[PDB]
Design a binder for this molecule. Structure first.
Ligand code: NAP
Ligand code: NAP
Ligand code: NAP
Ligand code: NAP
Ligand code: HBI
Ligand code: HBI
Ligand code: HBI
Ligand code: HBI
Lengths: 253, 253, 265, 265
């Protein structure tokens, strides 16, 4: 049986590495993207050449706004999950990785309204709707036909408890995502859907403060953790957030 | 004579916080959404005990636009803070207490639920804090108050999620992130930002589950903590969430 | 007139806690280990303000047996609580404040390791356990009609142990043990209405035995005020937690750190 | 080629499963035991039959007490001897798993109290400290050119200690101390590239010395599967954390509890 994984913001960096790691384990992968069309399609071509019909790409703005055919964020999220079912007839793994990240200072408007909707949508609201859509499809599937290893991974932040100066909305959205991890893990446990979090510290910086190695991590150093959590060997883990930060959160100023 | 703005001040914990602050000498701006009668009765009581010591202001704190060019949530939040400056010339304390609470099970009405639960519990508090901070920054150093304090009403039990309340749980998680991020960024202006998290308070069985006293708390048992945190004796406390739950979070199923 | 037992009450935070409780009307038992002169001067001050409102008791709270059959740590702890009952007939509040603090780096000197372990663990964790146990037994043995109406135990923790200080492993471990004691005791003593909370300072009355610039550098790291706290800024929190207005709070650790734990390197 | 792992309390249950899991990955394993001599030797025989000279056994009481050999043997010396056994036999020690642990009630409400404190604290916290110290020293004393490339220490913690089990104060305190050791050691040993993490079970291979309905009632509370875990469900996590794929993870505690810590009464 060939399982299916949906990875948001899969075009580059950590998302690409997660998609590659899952693919290497045998998963068919739905690569979501927003603006990185070229990169997403190049990645899909690579994976499809390795193994035919093992990758597809889907586009969506995950910000909490209405788009042009007006389509709500929920519908767009449900359509992402539906794309996996339409093409492969299943969705076993969901990785909420897509995320906007920029300053929203509290001390010195439309730019602030799109910032709020963008940072909250990508990091928290979209993951909620995606989890909701993912869960309904599992519930609507007769018990004898269900997969045996459902797993949802939310990409969190090991450092949000030590907030980055000027990134309040981002920090708040990651906090929301932690609560989603715990609430979904509890509510979806009856359907045997596990929900966990992976929180990087400093990964693939475009440094000397990280206790372990005095460097940021590679994409694999994070993605390998995600892949392990999706494996059947991790089937008793749920509702937990795993830090992959080389001890950075243990530091103080 | 200092000024305090309390959201959702009409009854229960909001009313007790407003009463507690008033007893300490504060002039209080009592915000309300639908409880006009209860808010005005409370204002009358406080004004009778001390003239010009209470006012009432109305606002929907949900993350939606209202009719007067439609009015955004931010504008309504800035107007709440401005009401304090227009009437008394100051705002020393902000208590984010207003909160919607109802189920959003994972297994059009979901659009207003999202905006309502997220707005009241997280987005409105963000904008209110932003407006509060701007008014302090725009005040010349010599005229500034000497005890600025913001209290966010959180939940001691969200880490042990209530089944079916995902959006609420997520929003409280966002509110905790706001507490830490705001405390760090507003520290230079000496504005303290803390949280108070009830467990079970003023309940409409479950009571017998609370280790301490085997009952839910009274409104005062929570509000007295809030008042202490606003006092100058608590001036070195910032960015921390204080549980007022009688040991409920120490329990397991 | 209620009674408070404060360990390591001779100076700094302990002294301020003792003063704060005394100002609220409490009679105070001031424990000390090596600061006899300071403890007795403090007792004299409190007794002058209000007669028979202070006493002093000496004890090594390290996890070792002392010369009288040797005297165990438990017996010494029970004796501390008993001193309050012998003199005033009650003990309403216990503040576990006494604490040793020095390096135990992981990277005829067996004496130093054996004694460091017993000292840092005893003062910060084991003695607090035995003290709480003795405190709880005295309340349980009191007929419900004679019991006080506001029992409160405060454990002095550390807001920064989750971001460990380099080279202080045993200290950090002991403070972790103290957090577990706070939670476990709060749950088990709830039926007797004994509340158990923690207060965790960040940087308070920072010792200045170093160059001025290095000292100013350390406190400048604290987000709120860019300084370490005063003893009162911490003790006032402890007093509030013991007040009847805080009667629904139990099993919680309150940080008094000016946002220091929110920082990263 | 051919790394070495030291696992305390390796004779049965989780410890055995961790030892088996590491052995299956290619590790040579030093199986520590206290009272389970027969079980430990049977396990060693199985592993050695599967791959010659791939398992040894060493005995030690990890309680914080001195033992009779001229002078009495301290806990530290016994801990250093455990690590030394690995170097004497195989010339290396890449992985240390602090799994051994005593667990029984210490209610708040003579020789029994003194030995419980030393036993529960020694096995769960103090021995792990000394073991880590000895492990770290052997790495530091090794020339850089000769050192292993994947050092990893795993401390077996408890996912449920923040929701204390009624009447287990000393155990809960010791597990709290163990969490502090995890963070402190991770920070101090980072320069030597020694990773220190924790794995916290909820309910695993739950002991059943009680009416069947009571047993069923307890495990039914775990949200995921409504049952306690198998030993493998925990040990597989430990093995992953020791793998080179987990080399950026340090100072973190991973719950393996099926969502049990998410529950409330
Ligand atoms: N890298 C780190 O040091 C670090 C640290 C802590 C946490 N994290 C978390 O780890 C995850 C991945 O990290 P990363 O650094 O690889 O992320 P990233 O490069 O910053 O962004 C990942 C992808 O998210 C997508 N995205 C952003 N806004 C979107 C929106 N409005 N709608 C739809 N997609 C949107 C983008 O897709 P397109 O390019 O296609 O537009 C982007 O490529 C994130 O959740 C992040 O928060 C990373
Ligand atoms: N009570 C508890 O056991 C408990 C437990 C955990 C946390 N808390 C937190 O403590 C705080 C107070 O608790 P509570 O029980 O007193 O709260 P509550 O009675 O449920 O509600 C407080 C007020 O919030 C206002 N509100 C709700 N939605 C609003 C919106 N869309 N816009 C503007 N105002 C809105 C309402 O004002 P109007 O009546 O005027 O419409 C309501 O009176 C809340 O933040 C709550 O989350 C309470
Ligand atoms: N100050 C800070 O920045 C800071 C930061 C974090 C946490 N804390 C916690 O807050 C509490 C008080 O802080 P502090 O700085 O005021 O403490 P401190 O000055 O270092 O010490 C308080 C007292 O502990 C007593 N003590 C030490 N070892 C003892 C032992 N073996 N037996 C009996 N008593 C012993 C000493 O009493 P004698 O003088 O009589 O010998 C000492 O005066 C401590 O628990 C500490 O861990 C403080
Ligand atoms: N099983 C669970 O549901 C659970 C839950 C939470 C945490 N944990 C943690 O996971 C780890 C393993 O769990 P487990 O249930 O497998 O443990 P366990 O069966 O209770 O005990 C493991 C071993 O510890 C050794 N031990 C006890 N006291 C000792 C001492 N004084 N000196 C030396 N060795 C001593 C014993 O070795 P001998 O038999 O040779 O005497 C025993 O076999 C423990 O650290 C435990 O705290 C387990
Ligand atoms: C720069 C910062 O310290 C750190 O590397 C982070 N980067 C990112 C992040 N989140 C996103 N979406 N993208 C990033 O590049 N969280 C933390
Ligand atoms: C029973 C329930 O869990 C508890 O009383 C809570 N009530 C409320 C809450 N939040 C709000 N806004 N209102 C409540 O009545 N959080 C928790
Ligand atoms: C020096 C350190 O950074 C901090 O101010 C602390 N001081 C002390 C402490 N504990 C004790 N007993 N004494 C201190 O002076 N814990 C933390
Ligand atoms: C019974 C209890 O709820 C749980 O299964 C635990 N068991 C054990 C434990 N720790 C040890 N050493 N042994 C156990 O059997 N911690 C928690």
């Amino acid at each position: 049986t060939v399982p299916v994984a949906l990875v948001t913001g899969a075009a580059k960096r950590l998302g690409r590495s997660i998609a590659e790691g899952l693919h290497a384990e045998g998963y068919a992968v739905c690569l979501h993207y927003h603006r990185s069309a070229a990169e997403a399609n190049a990645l899909s071509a690579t994976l499809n050449a390795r193994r035919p019909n093992s990758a597809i790409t889907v586009q969506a703005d995950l910000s909490n706004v209405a788009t042009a055919p007006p389509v709500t964020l929920f519908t767009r999220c449900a359509e992402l999950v539906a794309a996996c079912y339409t093409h492969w007839g299943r969705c076993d793994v969901l990785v909420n990785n897509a995320s906007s990240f920029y300053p929203t200072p509290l001390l010195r408007r439309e730019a602030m309204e799109t910032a709020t909707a963008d940072l909250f949508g990508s990091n928290a609201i979209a993951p909620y709707f995606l989890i909701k859509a993912f869960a309904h499809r599992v519930a609507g599937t007769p018990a004898k036909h269900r997969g045996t290893n459902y797993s949802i991974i939310n990409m969190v932040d090991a450092m949000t408890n030590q907030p980055l100066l000027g990134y309040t909305i981002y920090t708040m959205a990651k906090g929301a995502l932690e609560g989603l991890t715990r609430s979904a893990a509890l509510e979806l446990a009856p359907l045997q859907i596990r929900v966990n979090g992976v929180g990087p510290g400093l990964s693939v910086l475009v440094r000397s403060k990280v206790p372990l190695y005095q460097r940021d991590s590679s994409a694999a150093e994070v993605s390998d953790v995600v892949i392990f959590l999706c494996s059947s060997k991790a089937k008793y883990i749920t509702g937990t957030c795993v830090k992959v930060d080389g001890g950075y959160s243990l530091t103080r100023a």
